[PDB]
C-alpha cells in the first residue's frame, strides 16, 4: 500500500566492496574498523503508520533508529559519533543524510532486482554493500 513496502522485511549482507576506506574517511579508528569490517550483519525494515524502523543485527552489536520521513532526528551511530539525521525517500530511493562537526556522509538504499543495494558516500570515498533476503 506504500512506497517503502519493496523495503520491508529481513535482509543478510552478501557482499561489501571499499568499506575500509569509507571508514577511514569517516574517522573510525583501527579495532572499530577490524571488528565492524568482520560483520555479517542482518537488516530488518518495518514500517507502522508513519513511523520507520531500521535495525541491524550482528554478533558484537545490535543499533536500531525509528523515524519519519524528512524529520529531523538525533542518532549515536555504530561507531559511536552523535550525529544529526535526515531520511527522505527520493525517486524510490531511502536518502539519509548524517551531519556532525561540519562533515557530512549520505547513505543511500536502493531495490535493485531481489537485492536491496547499500551505498555509502563520504567525500570521494564510495563503499557498496549488497544484502540478500533472509
Ligand atoms: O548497515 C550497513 O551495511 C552500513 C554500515 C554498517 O553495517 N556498519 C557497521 S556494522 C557493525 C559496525 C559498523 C560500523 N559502521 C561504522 C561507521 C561507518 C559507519 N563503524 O562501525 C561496528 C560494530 C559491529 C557491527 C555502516 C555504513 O552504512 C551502512
Same mark, same amino acid.
Given at each position: 500500500?506504500?512506497?517503502?513496502?519493496?523495503?520491508? *522485511?529481513?535482509?543478510?549482507?552478501?557482499?561489501?566492496?571499499?568499506? /575500509?576506506?569509507?571508514? @577511514?574517511?569517516?574517522? %573510525?579508528?583501527?579495532?572499530?574498523? @577490524?571488528?565492524?569490517?568482520?560483520?555479517?550483519?542482518?537488516?530488518?525494515?518495518? %514500517?507502522?503508520? /508513519? %513511523?520507520?524502523?531500521? @535495525?541491524?543485527?550482528?554478533?558484537?552489536?545490535?543499533?536500531?533508529?525509528?523515524?519519519?520521513?524528512?524529520? !529531523?532526528?538525533?542518532?549515536?551511530?555504530? /561507531? /559511536?559519533?552523535?550525529?544529526?539525521?535526515?531520511?527522505?525517500?527520493?525517486? $524510490?530511493?531511502?536518502?539519509?543524510?548524517?551531519?556532525?562537526? *561540519? @562533515?557530512?556522509?549520505?547513505?543511500?538504499?536502493?531495490? !535493485?532486482?531481489?537485492?536491496?543495494?547499500?551505498?555509502?558516500?563520504?567525500? $570521494?570515498?564510495?563503499?557498496?554493500? %549488497?544484502? !540478500?533476503?533472509?
Amino acid at each position: 500500500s506504500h512506497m517503502c513496502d519493496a523495503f520491508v *522485511g529481513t535482509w543478510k549482507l552478501v557482499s561489501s566492496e571499499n568499506f /575500509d576506506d569509507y571508514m @577511514k574517511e569517516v574517522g %573510525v579508528g583501527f579495532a572499530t574498523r @577490524k571488528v565492524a569490517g568482520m560483520a555479517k550483519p542482518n537488516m530488518i525494515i518495518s %514500517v507502522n503508520g /508513519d %513511523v520507520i524502523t531500521i @535495525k541491524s543485527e550482528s554478533t558484537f552489536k545490535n543499533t536500531e533508529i525509528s523515524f519519519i520521513l524528512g524529520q !529531523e532526528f538525533d542518532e549515536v551511530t555504530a /561507531d /559511536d559519533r552523535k550525529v544529526k539525521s535526515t531520511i527522505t525517500l527520493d525517486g $524510490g530511493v531511502l536518502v539519509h543524510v548524517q551531519k556532525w562537526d *561540519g @562533515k557530512s556522509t549520505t547513505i543511500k538504499r536502493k531495490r !535493485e532486482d531481489d537485492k536491496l543495494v547499500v551505498e555509502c558516500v563520504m567525500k $570521494g570515498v564510495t563503499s557498496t554493500r %549488497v544484502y !540478500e533476503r533472509a
